[PDB]
């Protein structure tokens, strides 16, 4: 399906350096649209995309109040996690949360998500049924029992099927110029000799949106997966993304190699060569 909305919370303890910092960020697809930082001079939910600015004061006041209350609760969760793992109050720890909804082309819910981590490890996740939980260890099992008693899965389900999808659909309309526009990569192959006997071929994809893309090298029509250096897709800073893939090839054999590019913005996959 077509689209996602996601909120990401990070809460970071720092004993001796004040209360834990709380940072919240919201995305539609690969476009960030809000932020909150508890360390800011004046912490508030703040716009990070043009199409959200039009929301009125009640929107912004409500999101700010929610994030402040969340920051308080996540401070308590850090204290709790300390007890569940028999940990001292001198170390620095992190809770992270990701939640949100995926919708298809017609805008109906495809699936919901709600996952939490402690110190970068899975802690507790809502299952795809939006009714049951997967706890990673015996500490998270305590949280599971509490959340089962308090019908937390039911609340999440009501939000994921209702408000999450409705607000996502509204953002997608308000931001239709950008959120509903794919920018195809601009592509080329560069050649960097390394010795008399070898050279690197590097296949580039630039200026594309959304981030999802496949770049692959074939030698004589056969995928070179094990022999390709492929860098992480990286943000350009103008909403768009860049990636490259490279292969070390024997001198004179460059024409046996072909770069293949798939992206939602392209009417069909591309084949390039040097």
């Amino acid at each position: 399906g077509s689209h996602s909305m996601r909120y990401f919370y990070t809460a970071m303890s720092r004993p001796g350096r004040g209360e834990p910092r709380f940072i919240a960020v919201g995305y539609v697809d690969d476009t960030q649209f809000v932020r909150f930082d508890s360390d800011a001079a004046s912490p508030r939910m703040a716009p990070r995309a043009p199409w959200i600015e039009q929301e009125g004061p009640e929107y912004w006041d409500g999101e700010t109040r929610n994030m402040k209350a969340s920051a308080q609760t996540y401070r308590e969760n850090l204290r709790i996690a300390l007890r569940y793992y028999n940990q001292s109050e001198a170390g620095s720890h992190i809770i992270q949360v990701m939640y949100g909804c995926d919708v298809g082309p017609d805008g109906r819910l495809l699936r919901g998500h709600d996952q939490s981590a402690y110190d970068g490890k899975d802690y507790i996740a809502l299952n795809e049924d939006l009714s049951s939980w997967t706890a990673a260890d015996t500490a998270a099992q305590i949280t599971q029992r509490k959340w089962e008693a308090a019908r937390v899965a039911e609340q999440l389900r009501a939000y994921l099927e209702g408000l999450c999808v409705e607000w996502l659909r509204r953002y997608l309309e308000n931001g239709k110029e950008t959120l509903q526009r794919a920018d195809p990569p601009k592509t080329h192959v560069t050649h960097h000799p390394i010795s008399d006997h070898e050279a690197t071929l590097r296949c580039w994809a630039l200026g594309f949106y959304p981030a999802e893309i496949t770049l692959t090298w074939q030698r004589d029509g056969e995928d070179q997966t094990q022999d390709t250096e492929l860098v992480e897709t990286r943000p350009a800073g103008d909403r768009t993304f860049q990636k490259w893939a490279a292969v070390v090839v024997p001198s004179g054999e460059e024409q046996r190699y072909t770069c293949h590019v798939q992206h939602e913005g392209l009417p069909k996959p591309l084949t390039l060569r040097w």
């Binding site: 909120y7 919201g26 609760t73 308590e76 969760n77 959340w147 937390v152 607000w167």
Partner: peptide, 11 residues
Amino acid sequence: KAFSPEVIPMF
């Protein structure tokens, strides 16, 4: 818009 439960879930 963020999830906003009446009582926010504690661990």
